Amino acid sequence: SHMSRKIRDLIESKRFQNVITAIIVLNGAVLGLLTDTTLSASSQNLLERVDQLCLTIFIVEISLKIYAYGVRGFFRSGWNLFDFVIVAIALMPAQGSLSVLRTFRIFRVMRLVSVIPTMRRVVQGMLLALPGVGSVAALLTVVFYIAAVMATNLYGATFPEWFGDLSKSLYTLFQVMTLESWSMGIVRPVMNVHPNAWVFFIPFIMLTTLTVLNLFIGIIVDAMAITKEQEEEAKTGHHQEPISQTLLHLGDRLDRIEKQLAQNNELLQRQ
Amino acid sequence: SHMSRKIRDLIESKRFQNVITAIIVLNGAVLGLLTDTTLSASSQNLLERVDQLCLTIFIVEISLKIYAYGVRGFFRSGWNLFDFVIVAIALMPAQGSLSVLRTFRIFRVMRLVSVIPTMRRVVQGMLLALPGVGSVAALLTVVFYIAAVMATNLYGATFPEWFGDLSKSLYTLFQVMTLESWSMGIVRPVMNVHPNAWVFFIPFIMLTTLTVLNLFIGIIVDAMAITKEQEEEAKTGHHQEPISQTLLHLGDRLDRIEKQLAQNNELLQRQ
Amino acid sequence: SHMSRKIRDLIESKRFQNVITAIIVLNGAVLGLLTDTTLSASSQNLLERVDQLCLTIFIVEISLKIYAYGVRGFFRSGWNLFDFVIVAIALMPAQGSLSVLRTFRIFRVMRLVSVIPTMRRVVQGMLLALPGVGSVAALLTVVFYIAAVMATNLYGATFPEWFGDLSKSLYTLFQVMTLESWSMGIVRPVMNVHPNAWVFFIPFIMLTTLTVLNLFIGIIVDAMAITKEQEEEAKTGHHQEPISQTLLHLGDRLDRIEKQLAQNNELLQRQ
Amino acid sequence: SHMSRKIRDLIESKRFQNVITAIIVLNGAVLGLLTDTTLSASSQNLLERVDQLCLTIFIVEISLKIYAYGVRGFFRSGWNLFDFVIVAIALMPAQGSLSVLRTFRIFRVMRLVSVIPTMRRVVQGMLLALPGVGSVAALLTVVFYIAAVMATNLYGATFPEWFGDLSKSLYTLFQVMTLESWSMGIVRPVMNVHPNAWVFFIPFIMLTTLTVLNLFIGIIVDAMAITKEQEEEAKTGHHQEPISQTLLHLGDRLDRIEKQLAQNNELLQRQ
Numbered sequence A, B, C, D: 001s002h003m004s005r006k007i008r009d010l011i012e013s014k015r016f017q018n019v020i021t022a023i024i025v026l027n028g029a030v031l032g033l034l035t036d037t038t039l040s041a042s043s044q045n046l047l048e049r050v051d052q053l054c055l056t057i058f059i060v061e062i063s064l065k066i067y068a069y070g071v072r073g074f075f076r077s078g079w080n081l082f083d084f085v086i087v088a089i090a091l092m093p094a095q096g097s098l099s100v101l102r103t104f105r106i107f108r109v110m111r112l113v114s115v116i117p118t119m120r121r122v123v124q125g126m127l128l129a130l131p132g133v134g135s136v137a138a139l140l141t142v143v144f145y146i147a148a149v150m151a152t153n154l155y156g157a158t159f160p161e162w163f164g165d166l167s168k169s170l171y172t173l174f175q176v177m178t179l180e181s182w183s184m185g186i187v188r189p190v191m192n193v194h195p196n197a198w199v200f201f202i203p204f205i206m207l208t209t210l211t212v213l214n215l216f217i218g219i220i221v222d223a224m225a226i227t228k229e230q231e232e233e234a235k236t237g238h239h240q241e242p243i244s245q246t247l248l249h250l251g252d253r254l255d256r257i258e259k260q261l262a263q264n265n266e267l268l269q270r271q
């Protein structure tokens, strides 16, 4: 229909995107002011109306997309499903889930990432990096779990505040891994009772920082490459061979054209 | 005129640059001594004259450039505008701005960066890197802002010193992000009152350190490439294709010359 | 024999790997629950039987591999020797070694790395990186040892808790290197007695962080390359030229084909 | 002469290097034991003789090199001059210098770096990296110096322990830059008196960590490349074009051979 064709290009406009962006920025600002409890009841009830106004503009925007693209088409995008769920969960009377409350209205500012393409591409790159840093994250999860059981068994009886149980131990080890007070605060006290506790903790620190760093560098590097490669496909429309693939074959392609040149010289010299 | 031609090459000399450099180093040293309040009034009034002497030599230097290059030409360089504003703001009787005082005379040592070309190129590289780390810095700004609102709402009532308001929360979160006392100092105390506060803080730490690192690596990498690419254009005078562009097309250029070689072999074999 | 041929492909199946994986995950979980001392004697003796059950399934699995591959063949793999020693040391009545006890049953979860190929490849990459970060690790070991002797001689008499002996000094320096309370906790106190101790500690910090970082970046970079290069050999079966070798010769190979093209043009123009 | 020819190849042997290495390791160990003040006077005077024995073996070794290579030839190597000065300063009766004492005999273990080629190459790479991280280190030195003057002027009157003078301020800022207690320990206390001190400190932290990281990554990256490039020249004897030079011209060399191939096809098609 003509209604769904005109809707679509209204939705695809820069000023429509800019209207939605200023509505996200407005809802963000009013939720930030709402943290001020020194405000008068008049001001508090005023900002809650600005919140409802912002929320209804999103219900309108998301419904206009569902109509113009279809249910099959709108839900075909991960960023549209996120944009939907953000607004869809704001209209709910206590769903059957083990949550305390859905008072995280400020998670609406997260829509700024999806609405702004530059940030949507940046986040997108980091999301695609995660699968190819799955084995390292798993190795790190094993290393902690073994360290959490060891620490609870070794020190939970003498230092129950920090190694009282397995949950407590996972927390203290996360702290020791972030080098936060690990020595003056944890290991030095533990060492008075257990004089060789450094045998356990220095290797835990060495191992977890090498892995966390390998996990982070792995994400930052792949995401930076994925982003540039997506920009080339978005500009030229042609599929972009990943740089690692180009590098792994660079040797093969140079020695193929070395032999091709020498065999052309073979036919040329003898004529 | 001949006056503007001789001026220009005096200004473009190595010993003129070296004179200005020793004047910046002299003003820097006298401002550093001026921090000593144990000095006698004779010594204090002596150093303030050395400061005025240094400042007038800059008024002379900057005026000689304005004449020899012109207003259109001198203000065409960003480094010359900075060199101008540094001296121009030192001759001002309380401008209409919300500043406390312009007692930051030591910001004159910043001219050492502009006067010394090696450092002017190094800083220049970092300035050009910033635009292409704009999306990440924006993502980080959103992540804090959401975390600042969440922390003020969750903990500002029980721990007002650290999450009393939104400003206070931005500060504590910056501290938690720099891993500074985050656990023994902030989260462990918060956890006595709110037993699951780690659900909020460990992901905040994980997320903000991955982004800050991605923001820093993005700057350091692009700046290092931009600097080397500018050095090639400064040496050869020819435009330098950015390394990312060379890498993204390396595959295409190798398979083009593979086909070109094989098609030349096609015409050669059949003759 | 036909028994050793059928065994081998049972062992090489995905569901056999998945059975062993769920047995490792089960033994891991029961060892984690065993850390709970609030449990009843009935529950404690129940989990120890689940532990023995898991351990016997590994004795069966490892014996089935020893038979189907042979002793010469099974012990030809480093990952199989590790898988063997993990189970072989669990059946031992106090071997002649200077250990306290072999109560580290949770080191069985380490088999998840070997049993899961994705993680076995990830760890494998880090193990192969170590030899080519041997010189840096040695430089770091020399730097500490000299710093440990210097600190014990300078400060062990005045601050015996931290520099009492050489062992104590190695520990405090490891702490200072991880920037843990180095100033408010160690150097500031030391400086009251020895006003220029910063001359010793700031360079120690500068030097050890540059080396530890060079040691870590060296591992993370080589491991990431080794892993990708092993994946290419595993996919194509052909030997993969290391990227550093490709890069060091890239110049030579381009100027060889430049000359080969120009010499073919030499024979072509004159015909 | 024949004496200088036989000496030279004794000195160039692997077992001569191994003898010197075990003498360095022996002197290192005896200096480490000498830190133990609980030792008996018999043991203390025994180890000082082992120290003199080690020192004389170095006087013999260094004199054998001076004779076999000459003074012009021996002092032509930076590693030989270091090896000389290490031993030459151990035979000195209080030279005219502003030092406290030359009780740093453990700086002899530093000879292990020079004597062992693998480490001598590793250190060598880091030394050659320094010049090309000179501009960044200078930028960092300017940033601190300006921050040291600003902090002393702003806070030295209210917080003299930390910003009492310019020296004191350089130290506190180095601490704030290493994120050591910067907030709970320095900025939070300072903020009670000066409520907007975070305006000064958060940017100081942001700026100094980006630069220190750029300074460190710059060293680690160039040193890793310099080392691999020196290994290629040591293996092949041919000069190695630096990877940055190869990369900056890779585009030019590919489009030169693209045109050379197409112009050969031009002459081939028309024949």
Ligand SMILES: CC/C(=C(\c1ccccc1)c1ccc(OCCNC)cc1)c1ccccc1
Binding pocket: A128, A131, A132, A133, A221, A222, A223, A225, A226, A242, A243, A244, A245
């Ligand atoms: C296309 C980009 C990419 C990459 C990649 C990224 C940047 C630079 C060079 C390659 C990669 C490659 C292998 C890798 O190892 C772990 C997983 N093994 C399959 C992890 C990331 C990728 C993404 C999804 C799937 C498969 C590859």
Ligand SMILES: CC/C(=C(\c1ccccc1)c1ccc(OCCNC)cc1)c1ccccc1
Binding pocket: A132, A133, A218, A219, A221, A222, A243, A244, A245, A247, A248, C220, C221, C224, C225, C228, C229, C243
């Ligand atoms: C130049 C060497 C290199 C590479 C590389 C090596 C060989 C061939 C092609 C690329 C690389 C790239 C991405 C990668 O993804 C890991 C993702 N999950 C661990 C892993 C290795 C690298 C490594 C770290 C930093 C900068 C370059």
Ligand SMILES: CC/C(=C(\c1ccccc1)c1ccc(OCCNC)cc1)c1ccccc1
Binding pocket: B128, B131, B132, B133, B221, B222, B223, B225, B226, B242, B243, B244, B245
């Ligand atoms: C010419 C250097 C450069 C680069 C660059 C730098 C180093 C190595 C390889 C490329 C770059 C490329 C894309 C990027 O992604 C974010 C912004 N997308 C446009 C950020 C930096 C640049 C500078 C200004 C403008 C456009 C590119």
Ligand SMILES: CC/C(=C(\c1ccccc1)c1ccc(OCCNC)cc1)c1ccccc1
Binding pocket: A220, A221, A224, A225, A228, A229, A243, B132, B133, B218, B219, B221, B222, B243, B244, B245, B247, B248
């Ligand atoms: C070799 C892979 C690589 C690249 C790269 C990938 C593909 C094609 C061409 C270059 C790269 C370069 C600069 C870049 O700029 C980001 C600026 N704003 C996020 C982002 C990716 C890289 C990444 C990190 C470290 C070292 C190399």
Ligand SMILES: CC/C(=C(\c1ccccc1)c1ccc(OCCNC)cc1)c1ccccc1
Binding pocket: C128, C131, C132, C133, C221, C222, C223, C225, C226, C242, C243, C244, C245
């Ligand atoms: C095959 C991968 C590899 C590498 C390597 C790794 C990644 C990228 C580029 C090269 C390497 C090269 C030299 C190096 O320097 C110290 C030791 N000098 C021999 C350390 C690692 C290696 C592994 C084992 C042995 C020899 C090379």
Ligand SMILES: CC/C(=C(\c1ccccc1)c1ccc(OCCNC)cc1)c1ccccc1
Binding pocket: C132, C133, C218, C219, C221, C222, C243, C244, C245, C247, C248, D220, D221, D224, D225, D228, D229, D243
């Ligand atoms: C692109 C330059 C580069 C290289 C490089 C340099 C020249 C030729 C070929 C590769 C490199 C690679 C691996 C390496 O292994 C060190 C292992 N033990 C110290 C050392 C240097 C590098 C360095 C750091 C990060 C990302 C790339």
Ligand SMILES: CC/C(=C(\c1ccccc1)c1ccc(OCCNC)cc1)c1ccccc1
Binding pocket: D128, D131, D132, D133, D221, D222, D223, D225, D226, D242, D243, D244, D245
């Ligand atoms: C030959 C290695 C090298 C490099 C280099 C190192 C690794 C990878 C790629 C290049 C380099 C290049 C420019 C640079 O920028 C600052 C100084 N500008 C001249 C700093 C280091 C060098 C060493 C001494 C002198 C000149 C170059």
Ligand SMILES: CC/C(=C(\c1ccccc1)c1ccc(OCCNC)cc1)c1ccccc1
Binding pocket: B220, B221, B224, B225, B228, B229, B243, D132, D133, D218, D219, D221, D222, D243, D244, D245, D247, D248
């Ligand atoms: C692949 C891009 C890249 C490069 C690079 C860029 C263009 C052309 C050739 C190499 C580089 C290399 C060494 C360098 O030396 C700095 C020394 N003093 C600041 C600076 C830039 C890089 C950067 C950081 C990490 C890994 C690769």
Ligand SMILES: CCCCCCCCCC(=O)N(CCO)C[C@@H](O)[C@@H](O)[C@@H](O)[C@@H](O)CO
Binding pocket: A144, A160, A161, A162, A164, A167, A168, A169, A170, A171, A172, A174, B191, B195, B196, B198
């Ligand atoms: C990737 C690593 C993941 C680490 C996970 C941390 C453990 C999570 C469990 C947890 O922290 N608590 C849940 C239990 O209610 C509450 C805490 O309060 C408690 O664990 C202790 O930290 C202290 O209360 C004892 O001093």
Ligand SMILES: CCCCCCCCCC(=O)N(CCO)C[C@@H](O)[C@@H](O)[C@@H](O)[C@@H](O)CO
Binding pocket: B144, B160, B161, B162, B164, B167, B168, B169, B170, B171, B172, B174, D191, D195, D196, D198
């Ligand atoms: C990128 C992250 C940017 C973080 C920005 C930090 C917040 C800035 C506001 C601020 O810190 N103050 C301005 C208000 O005067 C003063 C502080 O003193 C106050 O916020 C608190 O830190 C304490 O005083 C309470 O314990």
Ligand SMILES: CCCCCCCCCC(=O)N(CCO)C[C@@H](O)[C@@H](O)[C@@H](O)[C@@H](O)CO
Binding pocket: A191, A195, A196, A198, C144, C160, C161, C162, C164, C167, C168, C169, C170, C171, C172, C174
């Ligand atoms: C790569 C760096 C390797 C550092 C190695 C650290 C030293 C290991 C020795 C050690 O720490 N102890 C063994 C001796 O029993 C026990 C400790 O308790 C003692 O050294 C002191 O830390 C305190 O007890 C004194 O305040």
Ligand SMILES: CCCCCCCCCC(=O)N(CCO)C[C@@H](O)[C@@H](O)[C@@H](O)[C@@H](O)CO
Binding pocket: C191, C195, C196, C198, D144, D160, D161, D162, D164, D167, D168, D169, D170, D171, D172, D174
């Ligand atoms: C690259 C950054 C370089 C930083 C350089 C640090 C300053 C060096 C001077 C210095 O620290 N002292 C020399 C003066 O004797 C002694 C110290 O004891 C003093 O400065 C203070 O730290 C405290 O004593 C006051 O609380």
Ligand code: NA
Binding pocket: A179, A180, B179, B180, C179, C180, D179, D180
């Ligand atoms: Na820290």
Ligand code: NA
Binding pocket: A181, B181, C181, D181
């Ligand atoms: Na602390």
Ligand code: NA
Binding pocket: A179, A180, A181, B179, B180, B181, C179, C180, C181, D179, D180, D181
């Ligand atoms: Na700390």
